């Protein structure tokens, strides 16, 4: 696994300003919109937009496809890391 998952966990934790939560507390595959963070669609846009600013990631947070990759950091890593390559 790349260090991107840690970056994404920290970026997600930092962007969402989670309290008493660090990259260690949240598993890479932990559901962002589930038991874990329990984020909302508005948060997905903020995160996706932040991601867009951070790595120019063209993600359609409104689209379910992005939601599919936003299930957990593992998926986010697949998206963002995929763009990181080349």
**Domain of 62: which CATH number?**
1.10.1200.10
Nearest of 36, 41, 38, 32 to residue 8 by alpha carbon: 32
Method: NMR
> Residue 24 sits in which domain range?
4-84
Give me the helices (H) in 1-86, please: 4-16, 41-55, 64-69, 73-84
The number of folded domains in the chain is 1
Using CA atoms, how far apart are residues 14 and 42, in angstroms rounded to an integer?
A: 16
Name the packing angle between helices 41-55 and 73-84 (round to 10°).
Answer: 30
56, exposed or middle or buried, with CB in 10 Å at 0-12, 13-18, 19+? exposed
Beta carbons of 16 and 54 less than 8 angstroms apart: no
Cβ(39)–Cβ(61) below 8 Å = no
């Amino acid at each position: 696994m790349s260090n991107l998952a840690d970056e994404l966990k920290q970026m997600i934790i930092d962007v969402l300003a989670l309290e008493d939560i660090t990259i260690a507390d949240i598993d890479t595959e932990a559901p962002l919109f589930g038991e874990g963070l329990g984020l909302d669609s508005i948060d997905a846009l903020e995160l996706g937009l932040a991601l867009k600013k951070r790595y120019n990631i063209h993600l359609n947070a409104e689209s379910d496809e992005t939601k599919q990759h936003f299930k957990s950091i593992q998926s986010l890593v697949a998206l963002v890391e995929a763009q990181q390559k080349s």
